[PDB]
C-alpha cells in the first residue's frame, strides 16, 4: 500500500 518515488516512500 506504500509506493516509492525518488527513493522516498509515501
Amino acid at each position, epitope marked *: 500500500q*506504500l509506493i*516509492n*518515488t*525518488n*527513493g522516498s*516512500w509515501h
Partner: antibody, heavy 118, light 111 residues
Framework: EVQLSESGPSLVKPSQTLSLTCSVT????????WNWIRKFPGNKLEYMGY???????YYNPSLRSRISITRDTSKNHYYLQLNSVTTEDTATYYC????????????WGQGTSVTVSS | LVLTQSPASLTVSLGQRATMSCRSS??????????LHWYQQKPGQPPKLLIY???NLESGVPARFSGSGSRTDFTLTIDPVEADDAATYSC?????????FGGGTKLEITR
C-alpha cells in the same frame, strides 16, 4: 519462482558505455521495483538505482550523471546503461526485484562480472 | 556517518551467539515501519535477504536469525551460530534518498 538472468559484455574500454540486460521470469515488471546493485572487489555493496512499475526511475546520486535504467514490458526485460566508465566501475553487477510487500530486495540474479580496461 | 556497522570483523565458535549492530545516524522509520534489512553475502553468490523491515524473518531463513532494532539502532542476532553462517552480513537502508549499504560484518567461525 521469480528468475533473473543477466547478460552483456564482460570487458568495456574506458569512457565507453557499459550495457547489461536483466530478463525476469515470474512476475511482471509492471509490478514492483526492479533494481541494479553492484559488488566491488573490496566486498562492498553499492546500490545503483531502479525502474518502477510505472516506469519511474530513482538513481544513486553519485551515478545520476552517467546512469540509465530502461525497460521493455513486451519482452519483460529491463536494461542498465553506464556511460563514461572508468576502472572504478569494475564490479559484479546484480539485478534484483524489490517486493511491494517486503519493501526490500528478495529475488536476485547470480550476477555478471564486468571489467573496465583498454 | 550515514550507515555504520559493528563489529567490522567477528570470530565466534559453533553453537554460540553472534550479535551485530547497524547505526543509522538518522531515523529510517516511516509509516510505522523500520526500513532496515539484513543481508547475508557468501563468495560467488548474490546477497541473500535474511531480515526485512528490522524484525521479520524472510521465508526459508532459519529461526536462528532475528532482528529487533528501532529508529536508529538495529541488531542482528545469530544463535546458535552454525558452520554455514561464515559470511559477510550487511544492513540496507531504504527509507529515503540515498539508499546505502553498510560496510559489512565479516563473521569467522572458531574451531
Amino acid at each position: 519462482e521469480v528468475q533473473l538472468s543477466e547478460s552483456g559484455p564482460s570487458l568495456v574500454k574506458p569512457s565507453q558505455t557499459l550495457s547489461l540486460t536483466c530478463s525476469v521470469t515470474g512476475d511482471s515488471i509492471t509490478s514492483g521495483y526492479w533494481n541494479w546493485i553492484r559488488k566491488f572487489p573490496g566486498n562492498k555493496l553499492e546500490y545503483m538505482g531502479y525502474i518502477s512499475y510505472s516506469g519511474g526511475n530513482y538513481y544513486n546520486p553519485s551515478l545520476r550523471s552517467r546512469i540509465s535504467i530502461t525497460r521493455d514490458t513486451s519482452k519483460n526485460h529491463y536494461y542498465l546503461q553506464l556511460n563514461s566508465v572508468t576502472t572504478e566501475d569494475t564490479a559484479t553487477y546484480y539485478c534484483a526485484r524489490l517486493s511491494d510487500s517486503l519493501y526490500a530486495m528478495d529475488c536476485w540474479g547470480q550476477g555478471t562480472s564486468v571489467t573496465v580496461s583498454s | 556517518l550515514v550507515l555504520t556497522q559493528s563489529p567490522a570483523s567477528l570470530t565466534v565458535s559453533l553453537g554460540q551467539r553472534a550479535t551485530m549492530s547497524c547505526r543509522s545516524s538518522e531515523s529510517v522509520d516511516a509509516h510505522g515501519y523500520s526500513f532496515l534489512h539484513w543481508y547475508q553475502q557468501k563468495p560467488g553468490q548474490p546477497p541473500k535477504l535474511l531480515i526485512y523491515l528490522a524484525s521479520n524473518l524472510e521465508s526459508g531463513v532459519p529461526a536462528r536469525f532475528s532482528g529487533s532494532g528501532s529508529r536508529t539502532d538495529f541488531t542482528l542476532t545469530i544463535d546458535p551460530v552454525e558452520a554455514d553462517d561464515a559470511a559477510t552480513y550487511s544492513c540496507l537502508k531504504n527509507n529515503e534518498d540515498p539508499w546505502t549499504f553498510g560496510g559489512g560484518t565479516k563473521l569467522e567461525i572458531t574451531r
